[PDB]
């Protein structure tokens, strides 16, 4: 004679974010002379 609560069910996922939106690189190779 056991009474159960009937709520022992689960499901699991994951998420992440490990980088910045943009990357910037420079090529200014001229001199104001």
Smallest gap, in angstroms, from Cβ of residue 6 to a copy of itself?
4
From candidates 15, 20, 31, 33, binder to Ca ion by CB under 5 A = 20
Instruction: Indicate the length of the chain as a whole number.
Output: 33
Angle at 20 between CA 25 and CA 23, to 5 degrees: 10
Size of the site for Ca ion (CB under 5 A): 2
Encoded tokens for 6? 């009937």
Which residues contact a copy of itself (rule: CB under 8 A)? 1-21, 23-26
List residues near Ca ion by CB under 5 A: 20, 23
């Amino acid at each position: 004679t056991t009474q159960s609560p009937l709520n022992s069910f689960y499901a699991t996922g994951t998420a992440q974010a490990v980088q910045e939106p943009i990357d910037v690189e420079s090529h200014l190779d001229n001199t104001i002379a």
